[PDB]
Design a protein around this ligand. Sequence first.
Ligand SMILES: Nc1ncnc2c1ncn2[C@@H]1O[C@H](COP(=O)(O)OP(=O)(O)OP(=O)(O)O)[C@@H](O)[C@H]1O
Ligand SMILES: Nc1ncnc2c1ncn2[C@@H]1O[C@H](COP(=O)(O)OP(=O)(O)OP(=O)(O)O)[C@@H](O)[C@H]1O
Ligand SMILES: [Mg+2]
Ligand SMILES: [Mg+2]
Lengths: 562, 562
Amino acid sequence: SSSCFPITLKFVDVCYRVKIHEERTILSGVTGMISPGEFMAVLGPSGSGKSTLLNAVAGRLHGSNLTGKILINDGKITKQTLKRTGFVAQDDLLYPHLTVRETLVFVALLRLPRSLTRDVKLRAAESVISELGLTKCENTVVGNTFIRGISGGERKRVSIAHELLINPSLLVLDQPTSGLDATAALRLVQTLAGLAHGKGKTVVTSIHQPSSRVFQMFDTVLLLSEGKCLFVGKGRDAMAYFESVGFSPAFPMNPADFLLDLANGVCQTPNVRQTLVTAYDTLLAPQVKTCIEVSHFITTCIATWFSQLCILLHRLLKERRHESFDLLRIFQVVAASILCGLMWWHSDYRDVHDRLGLLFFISIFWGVLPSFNAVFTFPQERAIFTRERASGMYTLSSYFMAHVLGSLSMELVLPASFLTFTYWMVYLRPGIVPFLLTLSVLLLYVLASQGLGLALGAAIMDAKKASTIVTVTMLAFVLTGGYYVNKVPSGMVWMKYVSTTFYCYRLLVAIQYGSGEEILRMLFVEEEVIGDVGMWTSVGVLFLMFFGYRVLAYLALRRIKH
Amino acid sequence: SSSCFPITLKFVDVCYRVKIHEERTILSGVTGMISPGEFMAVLGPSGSGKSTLLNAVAGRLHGSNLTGKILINDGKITKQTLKRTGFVAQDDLLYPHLTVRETLVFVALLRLPRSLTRDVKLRAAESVISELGLTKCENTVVGNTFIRGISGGERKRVSIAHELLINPSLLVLDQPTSGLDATAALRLVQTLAGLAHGKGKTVVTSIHQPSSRVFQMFDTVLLLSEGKCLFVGKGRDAMAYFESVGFSPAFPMNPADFLLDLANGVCQTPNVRQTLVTAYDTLLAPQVKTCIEVSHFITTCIATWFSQLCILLHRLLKERRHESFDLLRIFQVVAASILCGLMWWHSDYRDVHDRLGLLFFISIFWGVLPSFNAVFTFPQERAIFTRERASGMYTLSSYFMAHVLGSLSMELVLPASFLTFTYWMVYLRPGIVPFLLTLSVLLLYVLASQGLGLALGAAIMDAKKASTIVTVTMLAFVLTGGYYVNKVPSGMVWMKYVSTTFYCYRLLVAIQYGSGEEILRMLFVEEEVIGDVGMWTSVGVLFLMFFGYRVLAYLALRRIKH
Ligand SMILES: Nc1ncnc2c1ncn2[C@@H]1O[C@H](COP(=O)(O)OP(=O)(O)OP(=O)(O)O)[C@@H](O)[C@H]1O
Ligand SMILES: Nc1ncnc2c1ncn2[C@@H]1O[C@H](COP(=O)(O)OP(=O)(O)OP(=O)(O)O)[C@@H](O)[C@H]1O
Ligand SMILES: [Mg+2]
Ligand SMILES: [Mg+2]
């Protein structure tokens, strides 16, 4: 009911220039201060630079283009201050397969301060549904362009409640009432004004068509016009200003309509906007800037990480329930396995050259299949992972060990369904011990080759550009794999040791043909089991690749900090 | 300056129900008539069913859920009436790599009636840029979430000018002023009211926060409230209605704020919305329905198709100029080719088993590489192809023969860059005639295998679900390709004739080892060139597959009519 950790936002001489395809100035000398307990509205035409100003003061724009001082409590934007900052963008990026209640319950479980009952977090999640009026669309999905779900004015309020279930100190909303009608925008502005006045927060909105009652609820007003600001001050002090300059309406009208006609160059009675720029820069802006220079300012760390892992994994399983593309994958891999078992039906144990071809086609198949599906994991989560990474929703370790743990359920049943037909139709080395060793080596090789597609795809966050890198990489792995080229040059025999197909192929041949004595009694001293690498330094390098490719996939997602 | 082909839209008792996860009614008994020369505004809260009503009367919603009569000129919605209907949706789907002027010039070149000068079409394209005020953002890109481009209120006006460059008879706009300020929404409503009054069109908007001057510009007003309508009639007749029911404001306020407070259940003085439903259903709706039952109603065909092909192809090249992922593909395929040429450096012409392995790895490589990149062509164009297919922008044949003609530039230089190193480093059969025949067979096999990935991906419009179908399909093509399995069963020797790897492998072996007499003088009567299929019935089946896979890819895109 009372205040919180206060944030005083100060932006001093913010400029932003882009390069044409000289420069053009999107913002040029914006200066203001938003104290705690204040409700600022950023008004302006539809070209001004309001979303770049609100992306600059939320820490979402940075680089060599910005030329200003964004000071949160007289210090720069750290990651410790981006956790108490809630940013509602214009574009609403939500997960399409969860419902509204499943979305807001996951946000309330992740972001609320964790020294609370689960029932208190769920009651806080349903207390913001009833505040924004999301009760009729509570159990409706939040679908895509293709998936028809909730409305477009309910998708905005779901995104607002997404950042109300943080309890932030600085709330930066970019056009929150665009998409709501005349009486839900009034209730939303009443909610935000209650957050600013009662709870002592710092709310910064960019409202675009405010009513005359909605304009009365703002403390300060920043009027923007083509980057250059025209007015910083109280809302009730506007229209007492501009009569010192000489601009007054001919009709009793809305203050926002008049203040947005002046920002375009219309008075409804010759250089109106330049007159207002020169009038703001000499009568109002130094008195603003002298006002802003005088403002001076372990055992549960495992349980939090495991709760984040369980919440992220349970969300990850809730969106693969929408797809029924799991019986087609099984019925096609089983069909390919019946094909591979029927082509080698007349194969015998004594035909070693006929069976090393089968044991190499298995290594081609289960190195090409998982590695080419794993390049869609991280590129298809890019637009939401960037937003929830900039927001500070979770740690990267809990997010990474949920696509890892979420992939180890059907990438272990597809080679197990392949092998139970292909092993016994071809009738390889009989017994439960070689069958289970072949299954273990195949399940290890699938996880080792899946990490290659994870890493190529975390490094290149595009599933089309990564699908041609991983194709040539896996074909180079198949080429230096052991079945092709006889007289390899002496300078290129080292290239098979970085291949992951080589170790699986050597392990399968060593399981099938033992050590090289039970087949030579029956009859291939260089191509089969007699080789250089052993059976324990081939599972060691497969485990090393299984861990190292996921370490590289984690380090490639660590570069995305924005 | 005068009227056009008139459209009288009539929707009679439109209902729409969806299934929960009984039914819920999104719309329930909506009845209205929009004559030519009329400007109707659909008002309502943010759950009503306005976008489903405007998607129903634009022919974009259909199925077993709709239970009404949508009558355009007393006849159902055909494809001949969807060409004079322009629908502006809420979500703006534009191409991200074109600019604003390049977008609107392409729309003006495609949709204007083609018996006109190109300069007249370009002046009409720049006459709608100056009308909507898109002059400062004229040469700025229209980028994605990732690609920062024009603003969000300029992206709305680009989508409105996208449908103003059609000259339609029925203009259905779904929230066109959500995202514009107070003075661009007034100018947009003035533009649409000028189109309705001067040019005799039929404009249907769904406005959401209208001002008091914007409310004066509508002819008829349809007030919606949770599916059931509350008022159909003139805008000036509202607030003279509801005083027959007994609802009048306590303040002199906006008519839209009062009419949207009544649609929620607020009067600002007990069953307000049910009172208004029962008052509309007995005092106003029969007098509406008796008013709507009394309303009674070759050589250039090649040049148009070629102009559409050139416009669509020139747009297709303008977005692959953004990506610089063409030197990485070349520098990786050249690296793989140096790898394949260095592993077979010590290979001789007499080593036939050593060289059939190389000629089969080439057939693996250039059947796995193009076919796995071609599954991203049509799934990555899905959301814009559906919109421009429902709009009627182009024929499907011109759109299909521009991704076909747009892929035949770098899918012909990658095998040509592979082969110029791999042919002369391994030093295969010397001479310009076998080198050019091998290059021709490789360039034909690449185009034949690219069609497999086009068809699997036009049939499954998802690049992740198609990448696992095409992987197992190409691995089954490699398996029944000719190099693996010696003793194939007699019932499975027919499966190699549907493989595309088989014909390329047979043609490469027949080019390298001739007919089977110049190698047997030097020394493989069953595995090399002596085979069943000839050299002319292997290029014939490759041409048949190159044509048939693209015919199937065209017929799979023909199912998407929505
Ligand atoms: N396919 C669906 N399944 C379930 N509910 C749906 C579906 N489509 C729409 N709805 C619900 O129906 C209502 C109508 O949505 P619609 O988009 O039709 O309304 P709207 O008036 O356009 O809203 P807004 O003004 O906020 O955009 C919304 O509550 C939406 O939640
Ligand atoms: N990266 C860019 N390159 C070129 N021009 C840009 C870029 N980003 C923004 N602009 C232009 O700068 C202006 C500011 O955009 P911004 O989104 O900042 O304004 P806005 O006030 O939010 O508009 P709206 O109210 O319509 O959403 C717009 O004209 C946009 O065209
Ligand atoms: Mg904005
Ligand atoms: Mg709508």
